[PDB]
Amino acid sequence: AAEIVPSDMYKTGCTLRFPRIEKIRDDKEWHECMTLDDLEQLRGKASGKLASKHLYI
DNA sequence: AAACATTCGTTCACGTGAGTTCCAGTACAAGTCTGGTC
């Protein structure tokens, strides 16, 4: 997703911008899902934008 | 004088380069489905 933005249609209080599926993980169990704490940490890490680090070459 | 070896023009098979047709991979563009909010 491009970023995480506030919303009122979802329980987490936030929704993704431009979401798309990259892979249906057949190796991850259901209990390995993200947690609200991790989502809050990711949201606060870079002001909601999911692109933080710098391209290198 | 008679027998054997060599040479020559011919013949066949097999291999390699250039032309033509057909199909797969690639590129791009448009269509279709979806997401989010105000």
Curated annotation (Swiss-Prot):
Domain of life, source organism: Eukaryota
Signal peptide (from-to): none
Spans annotated as Required for catalytic activity: 50-57
Protein localization: Nucleus
Reported tissue expression: Testis, thymus, prostate and heart.
Biological function: DNA ligase involved in DNA non-homologous end joining (NHEJ); required for double-strand break (DSB) repair and V(D)J recombination. Catalyzes the NHEJ ligation step of the broken DNA during DSB repair by resealing the DNA breaks after the gap filling is completed. Joins single-strand breaks in a double-stranded polydeoxynucleotide in an ATP-dependent reaction. LIG4 is mechanistically flexible: it can ligate nicks as well as compatible DNA overhangs alone, while in the presence of XRCC4, it can ligate ends with 2-nucleotides (nt) microhomology and 1-nt gaps.
Similarity comment: Belongs to the ATP-dependent DNA ligase family.
Subunit-level organization: Interacts with XRCC4; the LIG4-XRCC4 subcomplex has a 1:2 stoichiometry and XRCC4 is required for LIG4 stability. Component of the core long-range non-homologous end joining (NHEJ) complex (also named DNA-PK complex) composed of PRKDC, LIG4, XRCC4, XRCC6/Ku70, XRCC5/Ku86 and NHEJ1/XLF. Additional component of the NHEJ complex includes PAXX. Following autophosphorylation, PRKDC dissociates from DNA, leading to formation of the short-range NHEJ complex, composed of LIG4, XRCC4, XRCC6/Ku70, XRCC5/Ku86 and NHEJ1/XLF. Interacts with DCLRE1C; the interaction is direct. Interacts with APLF.
Disease: LIG4 syndrome: Characterized by immunodeficiency and developmental and growth delay. Patients display unusual facial features, microcephaly, growth and/or developmental delay, pancytopenia, and various skin abnormalities.
Name of this chain's protein: DNA ligase 4
UniProt organism field: Homo sapiens (Human)
Taxonomic classification: Eukaryota, Metazoa, Chordata, Craniata, Vertebrata
Portion of the parent chain present: 561 to 617 of 911
